[PDB]
Amino acid sequence: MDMQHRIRQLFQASIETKQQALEVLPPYIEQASLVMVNALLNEGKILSCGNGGSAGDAQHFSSELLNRERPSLPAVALTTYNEVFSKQIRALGQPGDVLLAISTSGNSANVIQAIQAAHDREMLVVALTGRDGGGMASLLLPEDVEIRVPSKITARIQEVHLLAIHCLCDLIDRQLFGS
Amino acid sequence: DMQHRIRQLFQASIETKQQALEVLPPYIEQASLVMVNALLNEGKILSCGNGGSAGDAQHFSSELLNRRPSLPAVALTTNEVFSKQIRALGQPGDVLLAISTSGNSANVIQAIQAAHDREMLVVALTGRDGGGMASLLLPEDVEIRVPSKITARIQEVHLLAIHCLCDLIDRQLFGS
Amino acid sequence: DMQHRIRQLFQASIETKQQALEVLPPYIEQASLVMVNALLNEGKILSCGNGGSAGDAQHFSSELLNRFERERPSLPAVALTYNEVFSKQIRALGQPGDVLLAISTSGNSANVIQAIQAAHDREMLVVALTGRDGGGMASLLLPEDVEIRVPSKITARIQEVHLLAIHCLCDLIDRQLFG
Amino acid sequence: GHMDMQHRIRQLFQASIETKQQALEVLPPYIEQASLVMVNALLNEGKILSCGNGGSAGDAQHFSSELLNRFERERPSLPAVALTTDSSYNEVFSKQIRALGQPGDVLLAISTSGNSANVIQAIQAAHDREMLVVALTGRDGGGMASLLLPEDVEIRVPSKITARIQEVHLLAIHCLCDLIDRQLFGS
Ligand SMILES: [Cl-]
């Protein structure tokens, strides 16, 4: 009785959070995918990163796109001391590339450091966040895009992030190659 | 591009979770009792999956292991890649959490067989028609099949389903 | 002169190995019997390392378990992959009589030290691959544990002798179990 | 201790020692040459990509992680990155090389036999991006060696024994890093 209730409860919270997100996120998902499509078109790449339950999201986004029957898109997750991402971005990133930075709270020291490295290399940033945006939100420059899930709950934020990413991939293919 | 297309993807996501809500909860409940059972009997949970399911396997385990008290859940961390590790680490009673969008991942199929040889129970997160994984399941195993043929929809529901399992285990062992 | 330096590095590598040859073989033999005894008693080997010692740990377990380069039976050797990430996996997976292969070049890795503690707590024996003079962790070992301490302070030379030592461990395990 | 095991341990030590002594007599010119191509690439604002299969993968990641992260040693970070795997699958390296590689960059490619299809394909991808290749190999060099253009460098360990090739590879990698640091940051 309680367990079936709790399940229904979590399902409905997940669904309600997505309906809220539906009202506020589409313009930001559109701008991000556009920023990404323009970078690819100019022979740039996308580097993605995230901490913990966001790390899978960075690699899900990238593998989808890199490993393909549309053309392989140059999208690489960084993987494998808050400098782990930042150093790879300095090694790999060139002007006009795009950083996808994923953090449910926006407080990841190493994603914050990632965003500085991306700015130093003249890259645009697509930031996937939740809650109040955290420290990352405040570090975004005017040309950067923020996709902020309207929720405080870590697990609902993650659920909308997966969806957001699936939206970005889909809009990237439609814009580049066509429906 | 199209906001209209974004709303459309969001609406499709919502609709599948609604379809999933009408069919999955009793299985989600079963799996969780199976997992709480094994953990109370001093056992453990191993998880696995390929493609867009590997992260889910890790996300489940490292919630429970790393953090509440830590719970013995380990993700198999790389067609006998998983099967070999189950043989080595599995003990009678343990649970395998196996995740696949198609039900056709050859190494998770061999993961399921290895778990059976260990006298382990299997919880299978699947979609579509359940593939070769469904046909391997024994009566005491639990399928959680997403009523969708679309990979991206199954993945979205699989993450919700994994969040539920975690929640129900903590609910039963610790309470709320 | 770059030639002078290469031939100096090769000689330092050869010379460390020669001095390793004078202290190590008893401890390699003892380490391997411990591992063989555990496996014959239906046990398993868990292995762990940090930094450059981390390939070593994976290489050890990958070798025996997957058998990608030689055709003999698979052995339950498993590499482990926040000072508690190793501790917590050992606690979750280790059963009494199991063996931990613990690798580091300094002997000071916080997690590997805590891996040792988690191994003893689970009534496991430890084979410890170290260099320098073992320092800590090498002071945590109990009478039935085994240390293989490279007679060197140079990280690179220690890595080199570790790889050889692991190759000796795997080889004698097979030699004792399959002749 | 018991004789056989003591015999086996000491015979392996001796074979490792003897393989290194043989390697010493033929590898230095190619090791120097390799480190020169790497240094020249970095001086021209290049980067190094590394890859390897099975037991070589560790070497690949060891090389680039030391150079880039600088845990073990406090000197400047160098743009050296290991190519990942983790979820046909023979294109995992080449797909990344085509995304990340630039004209002038260097691929350090590691294989003991030289026949792994994904490293063979990595070499092609590097060539298509106008990158130079440093190939750590053994035995006869395999298919990999057959693909090397004249600006490339091969470091072929003079052994047919996997374990022996792996040990010399680790040494080669330690020399390359030493030589890169010497040339850039002082002997
Ligand atoms: Cl589909």
PDB file of C-alpha atoms in Angstrom, chain C:
ATOM      1  CA  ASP C   1      74.121  13.450 -25.238  1.00  0.00           C
ATOM      2  CA  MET C   2      70.446  12.392 -25.392  1.00  0.00           C
ATOM      3  CA  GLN C   3      72.007   9.038 -26.304  1.00  0.00           C
ATOM      4  CA  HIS C   4      74.188   9.275 -23.142  1.00  0.00           C
ATOM      5  CA  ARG C   5      71.015   9.870 -21.120  1.00  0.00           C
ATOM      6  CA  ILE C   6      69.001   6.995 -22.687  1.00  0.00           C
ATOM      7  CA  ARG C   7      71.836   4.528 -22.052  1.00  0.00           C
ATOM      8  CA  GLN C   8      72.081   5.881 -18.468  1.00  0.00           C
ATOM      9  CA  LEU C   9      68.305   5.326 -17.951  1.00  0.00           C
ATOM     10  CA  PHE C  10      68.510   1.773 -19.385  1.00  0.00           C
ATOM     11  CA  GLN C  11      71.451   1.013 -17.086  1.00  0.00           C
ATOM     12  CA  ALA C  12      69.693   2.426 -14.027  1.00  0.00           C
ATOM     13  CA  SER C  13      66.727   0.241 -14.994  1.00  0.00           C
ATOM     14  CA  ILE C  14      68.921  -2.847 -15.441  1.00  0.00           C
ATOM     15  CA  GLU C  15      70.848  -2.115 -12.216  1.00  0.00           C
ATOM     16  CA  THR C  16      67.739  -1.705 -10.027  1.00  0.00           C
ATOM     17  CA  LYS C  17      66.483  -4.998 -11.374  1.00  0.00           C
ATOM     18  CA  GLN C  18      69.796  -6.651 -10.440  1.00  0.00           C
ATOM     19  CA  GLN C  19      69.528  -5.371  -6.868  1.00  0.00           C
ATOM     20  CA  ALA C  20      65.851  -6.372  -6.832  1.00  0.00           C
ATOM     21  CA  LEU C  21      67.069  -9.853  -7.805  1.00  0.00           C
ATOM     22  CA  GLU C  22      69.022 -10.013  -4.543  1.00  0.00           C
ATOM     23  CA  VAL C  23      66.176  -9.213  -2.098  1.00  0.00           C
ATOM     24  CA  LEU C  24      62.865 -10.003  -3.820  1.00  0.00           C
ATOM     25  CA  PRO C  25      62.535 -13.675  -4.928  1.00  0.00           C
ATOM     26  CA  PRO C  26      61.854 -15.054  -1.425  1.00  0.00           C
ATOM     27  CA  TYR C  27      59.005 -12.565  -0.951  1.00  0.00           C
ATOM     28  CA  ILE C  28      57.679 -13.117  -4.470  1.00  0.00           C
ATOM     29  CA  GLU C  29      57.585 -16.864  -3.776  1.00  0.00           C
ATOM     30  CA  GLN C  30      55.866 -16.378  -0.406  1.00  0.00           C
ATOM     31  CA  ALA C  31      53.362 -13.890  -1.934  1.00  0.00           C
ATOM     32  CA  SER C  32      52.432 -16.320  -4.673  1.00  0.00           C
ATOM     33  CA  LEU C  33      51.925 -19.332  -2.343  1.00  0.00           C
ATOM     34  CA  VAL C  34      49.542 -17.196  -0.259  1.00  0.00           C
ATOM     35  CA  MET C  35      47.620 -16.391  -3.426  1.00  0.00           C
ATOM     36  CA  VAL C  36      47.653 -20.001  -4.671  1.00  0.00           C
ATOM     37  CA  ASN C  37      46.513 -21.298  -1.238  1.00  0.00           C
ATOM     38  CA  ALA C  38      43.618 -18.804  -1.178  1.00  0.00           C
ATOM     39  CA  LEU C  39      42.465 -19.765  -4.685  1.00  0.00           C
ATOM     40  CA  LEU C  40      42.653 -23.504  -3.909  1.00  0.00           C
ATOM     41  CA  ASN C  41      40.569 -22.776  -0.775  1.00  0.00           C
ATOM     42  CA  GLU C  42      37.831 -21.434  -3.110  1.00  0.00           C
ATOM     43  CA  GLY C  43      38.912 -17.792  -2.468  1.00  0.00           C
ATOM     44  CA  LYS C  44      39.649 -14.778  -4.644  1.00  0.00           C
ATOM     45  CA  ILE C  45      42.126 -11.964  -5.210  1.00  0.00           C
ATOM     46  CA  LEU C  46      41.125  -8.296  -5.094  1.00  0.00           C
ATOM     47  CA  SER C  47      43.751  -5.836  -6.350  1.00  0.00           C
ATOM     48  CA  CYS C  48      44.159  -2.079  -6.076  1.00  0.00           C
ATOM     49  CA  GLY C  49      46.581   0.745  -6.803  1.00  0.00           C
ATOM     50  CA  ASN C  50      46.862   4.491  -7.314  1.00  0.00           C
ATOM     51  CA  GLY C  51      48.396   6.511 -10.133  1.00  0.00           C
ATOM     52  CA  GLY C  52      50.899   4.549 -12.218  1.00  0.00           C
ATOM     53  CA  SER C  53      50.371   1.595  -9.869  1.00  0.00           C
ATOM     54  CA  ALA C  54      46.752   1.415 -11.086  1.00  0.00           C
ATOM     55  CA  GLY C  55      47.468  -0.099 -14.502  1.00  0.00           C
ATOM     56  CA  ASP C  56      49.499  -2.770 -12.680  1.00  0.00           C
ATOM     57  CA  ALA C  57      46.515  -3.780 -10.500  1.00  0.00           C
ATOM     58  CA  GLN C  58      44.158  -3.954 -13.500  1.00  0.00           C
ATOM     59  CA  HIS C  59      46.750  -5.743 -15.566  1.00  0.00           C
ATOM     60  CA  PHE C  60      47.228  -8.405 -12.864  1.00  0.00           C
ATOM     61  CA  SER C  61      43.486  -9.185 -12.518  1.00  0.00           C
ATOM     62  CA  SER C  62      42.639  -8.742 -16.243  1.00  0.00           C
ATOM     63  CA  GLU C  63      45.341 -11.305 -17.104  1.00  0.00           C
ATOM     64  CA  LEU C  64      44.081 -14.085 -14.792  1.00  0.00           C
ATOM     65  CA  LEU C  65      40.354 -13.488 -15.232  1.00  0.00           C
ATOM     66  CA  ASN C  66      39.913 -12.706 -18.903  1.00  0.00           C
ATOM     67  CA  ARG C  67      42.783 -14.747 -20.372  1.00  0.00           C
ATOM     68  CA  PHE C  68      43.073 -12.482 -23.463  1.00  0.00           C
ATOM     69  CA  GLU C  69      46.723 -13.389 -24.101  1.00  0.00           C
ATOM     70  CA  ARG C  70      47.000 -17.004 -22.842  1.00  0.00           C
ATOM     71  CA  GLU C  71      44.592 -19.954 -22.953  1.00  0.00           C
ATOM     72  CA  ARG C  72      44.173 -21.438 -19.453  1.00  0.00           C
ATOM     73  CA  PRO C  73      41.291 -21.414 -16.887  1.00  0.00           C
ATOM     74  CA  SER C  74      39.962 -18.085 -15.588  1.00  0.00           C
ATOM     75  CA  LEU C  75      40.899 -17.245 -12.037  1.00  0.00           C
ATOM     76  CA  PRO C  76      38.895 -15.022  -9.644  1.00  0.00           C
ATOM     77  CA  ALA C  77      41.221 -12.012  -9.781  1.00  0.00           C
ATOM     78  CA  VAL C  78      39.337  -8.684  -9.672  1.00  0.00           C
ATOM     79  CA  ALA C  79      40.699  -5.154  -9.892  1.00  0.00           C
ATOM     80  CA  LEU C  80      39.006  -2.499  -7.783  1.00  0.00           C
ATOM     81  CA  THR C  81      38.084   0.719  -9.652  1.00  0.00           C
ATOM     82  CA  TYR C  82      37.292   9.857  -0.903  1.00  0.00           C
ATOM     83  CA  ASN C  83      39.882   7.730   0.912  1.00  0.00           C
ATOM     84  CA  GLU C  84      37.187   5.027   1.180  1.00  0.00           C
ATOM     85  CA  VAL C  85      36.497   4.040  -2.484  1.00  0.00           C
ATOM     86  CA  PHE C  86      38.743   0.958  -2.119  1.00  0.00           C
ATOM     87  CA  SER C  87      37.782   0.318   1.525  1.00  0.00           C
ATOM     88  CA  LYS C  88      34.102   0.304   0.671  1.00  0.00           C
ATOM     89  CA  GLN C  89      34.430  -2.142  -2.232  1.00  0.00           C
ATOM     90  CA  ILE C  90      36.537  -4.511  -0.124  1.00  0.00           C
ATOM     91  CA  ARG C  91      33.947  -4.379   2.677  1.00  0.00           C
ATOM     92  CA  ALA C  92      31.199  -5.081   0.124  1.00  0.00           C
ATOM     93  CA  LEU C  93      33.085  -7.868  -1.715  1.00  0.00           C
ATOM     94  CA  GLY C  94      35.827  -9.378   0.461  1.00  0.00           C
ATOM     95  CA  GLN C  95      35.250 -12.682   2.271  1.00  0.00           C
ATOM     96  CA  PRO C  96      37.682 -14.157   4.853  1.00  0.00           C
ATOM     97  CA  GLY C  97      40.701 -15.886   3.338  1.00  0.00           C
ATOM     98  CA  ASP C  98      40.490 -13.718   0.181  1.00  0.00           C
ATOM     99  CA  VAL C  99      43.746 -11.904  -0.711  1.00  0.00           C
ATOM    100  CA  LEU C 100      44.313  -8.209  -1.418  1.00  0.00           C
ATOM    101  CA  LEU C 101      47.066  -7.247  -3.855  1.00  0.00           C
ATOM    102  CA  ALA C 102      47.852  -3.665  -2.773  1.00  0.00           C
ATOM    103  CA  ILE C 103      50.174  -1.622  -5.018  1.00  0.00           C
ATOM    104  CA  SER C 104      51.821   1.750  -4.578  1.00  0.00           C
ATOM    105  CA  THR C 105      55.303   3.162  -5.143  1.00  0.00           C
ATOM    106  CA  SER C 106      55.406   5.504  -2.118  1.00  0.00           C
ATOM    107  CA  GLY C 107      53.492   3.153   0.164  1.00  0.00           C
ATOM    108  CA  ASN C 108      51.571   6.230   1.332  1.00  0.00           C
ATOM    109  CA  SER C 109      48.388   6.210  -0.779  1.00  0.00           C
ATOM    110  CA  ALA C 110      45.601   7.121   1.654  1.00  0.00           C
ATOM    111  CA  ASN C 111      43.078   4.777   0.028  1.00  0.00           C
ATOM    112  CA  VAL C 112      45.487   1.816  -0.318  1.00  0.00           C
ATOM    113  CA  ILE C 113      46.371   2.216   3.372  1.00  0.00           C
ATOM    114  CA  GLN C 114      42.635   2.163   4.036  1.00  0.00           C
ATOM    115  CA  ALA C 115      42.264  -0.803   1.666  1.00  0.00           C
ATOM    116  CA  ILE C 116      44.732  -2.715   3.854  1.00  0.00           C
ATOM    117  CA  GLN C 117      42.704  -1.851   6.963  1.00  0.00           C
ATOM    118  CA  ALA C 118      39.504  -2.977   5.213  1.00  0.00           C
ATOM    119  CA  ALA C 119      41.224  -6.224   4.180  1.00  0.00           C
ATOM    120  CA  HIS C 120      42.388  -7.103   7.726  1.00  0.00           C
ATOM    121  CA  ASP C 121      38.913  -6.196   9.025  1.00  0.00           C
ATOM    122  CA  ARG C 122      37.489  -8.808   6.593  1.00  0.00           C
ATOM    123  CA  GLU C 123      40.082 -11.402   7.736  1.00  0.00           C
ATOM    124  CA  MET C 124      41.924 -11.182   4.399  1.00  0.00           C
ATOM    125  CA  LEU C 125      45.652 -11.547   3.801  1.00  0.00           C
ATOM    126  CA  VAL C 126      47.572  -8.771   2.011  1.00  0.00           C
ATOM    127  CA  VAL C 127      50.317  -8.930  -0.606  1.00  0.00           C
ATOM    128  CA  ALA C 128      51.814  -5.423  -0.665  1.00  0.00           C
ATOM    129  CA  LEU C 129      53.833  -4.139  -3.609  1.00  0.00           C
ATOM    130  CA  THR C 130      55.921  -1.221  -2.426  1.00  0.00           C
ATOM    131  CA  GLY C 131      59.168   0.630  -3.015  1.00  0.00           C
ATOM    132  CA  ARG C 132      61.322   3.127  -1.121  1.00  0.00           C
ATOM    133  CA  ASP C 133      61.366   1.649   2.362  1.00  0.00           C
ATOM    134  CA  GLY C 134      57.678   0.757   2.563  1.00  0.00           C
ATOM    135  CA  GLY C 135      57.134   3.415   5.258  1.00  0.00           C
ATOM    136  CA  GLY C 136      53.514   3.389   6.378  1.00  0.00           C
ATOM    137  CA  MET C 137      51.214   0.612   5.151  1.00  0.00           C
ATOM    138  CA  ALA C 138      54.381  -1.502   5.444  1.00  0.00           C
ATOM    139  CA  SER C 139      54.056  -0.896   9.202  1.00  0.00           C
ATOM    140  CA  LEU C 140      50.358  -1.928   9.128  1.00  0.00           C
ATOM    141  CA  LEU C 141      51.162  -5.450   7.859  1.00  0.00           C
ATOM    142  CA  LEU C 142      50.530  -8.472  10.068  1.00  0.00           C
ATOM    143  CA  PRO C 143      52.826 -11.549  10.458  1.00  0.00           C
ATOM    144  CA  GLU C 144      50.931 -13.481   7.749  1.00  0.00           C
ATOM    145  CA  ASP C 145      50.826 -10.630   5.191  1.00  0.00           C
ATOM    146  CA  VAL C 146      53.692 -10.277   2.660  1.00  0.00           C
ATOM    147  CA  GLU C 147      55.591  -7.208   1.472  1.00  0.00           C
ATOM    148  CA  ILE C 148      57.501  -7.003  -1.793  1.00  0.00           C
ATOM    149  CA  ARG C 149      59.577  -3.866  -1.323  1.00  0.00           C
ATOM    150  CA  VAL C 150      61.629  -2.690  -4.288  1.00  0.00           C
ATOM    151  CA  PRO C 151      65.151  -1.689  -3.171  1.00  0.00           C
ATOM    152  CA  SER C 152      64.785   1.796  -4.681  1.00  0.00           C
ATOM    153  CA  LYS C 153      63.514   5.304  -4.032  1.00  0.00           C
ATOM    154  CA  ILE C 154      63.041   6.328  -7.696  1.00  0.00           C
ATOM    155  CA  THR C 155      59.341   6.133  -8.711  1.00  0.00           C
ATOM    156  CA  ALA C 156      60.077   5.155 -12.314  1.00  0.00           C
ATOM    157  CA  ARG C 157      62.472   2.318 -11.332  1.00  0.00           C
ATOM    158  CA  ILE C 158      59.910   1.077  -8.736  1.00  0.00           C
ATOM    159  CA  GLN C 159      57.146   1.002 -11.381  1.00  0.00           C
ATOM    160  CA  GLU C 160      59.455  -1.012 -13.637  1.00  0.00           C
ATOM    161  CA  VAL C 161      60.230  -3.666 -10.975  1.00  0.00           C
ATOM    162  CA  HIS C 162      56.547  -3.776  -9.953  1.00  0.00           C
ATOM    163  CA  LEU C 163      55.530  -4.724 -13.480  1.00  0.00           C
ATOM    164  CA  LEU C 164      58.153  -7.500 -13.505  1.00  0.00           C
ATOM    165  CA  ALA C 165      56.997  -8.657 -10.042  1.00  0.00           C
ATOM    166  CA  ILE C 166      53.378  -8.877 -11.123  1.00  0.00           C
ATOM    167  CA  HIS C 167      54.498 -10.867 -14.170  1.00  0.00           C
ATOM    168  CA  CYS C 168      56.308 -13.247 -11.752  1.00  0.00           C
ATOM    169  CA  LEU C 169      53.221 -13.495  -9.523  1.00  0.00           C
ATOM    170  CA  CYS C 170      50.860 -14.422 -12.407  1.00  0.00           C
ATOM    171  CA  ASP C 171      53.351 -16.870 -13.831  1.00  0.00           C
ATOM    172  CA  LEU C 172      53.942 -18.785 -10.585  1.00  0.00           C
ATOM    173  CA  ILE C 173      50.197 -18.831  -9.831  1.00  0.00           C
ATOM    174  CA  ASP C 174      49.664 -20.604 -13.187  1.00  0.00           C
ATOM    175  CA  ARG C 175      52.743 -22.768 -12.623  1.00  0.00           C
ATOM    176  CA  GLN C 176      51.461 -23.964  -9.246  1.00  0.00           C
ATOM    177  CA  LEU C 177      47.837 -24.454 -10.388  1.00  0.00           C
ATOM    178  CA  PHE C 178      48.384 -25.879 -13.910  1.00  0.00           C
ATOM    179  CA  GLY C 179      52.066 -26.942 -13.932  1.00  0.00           C
TER     180      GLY C 179
END
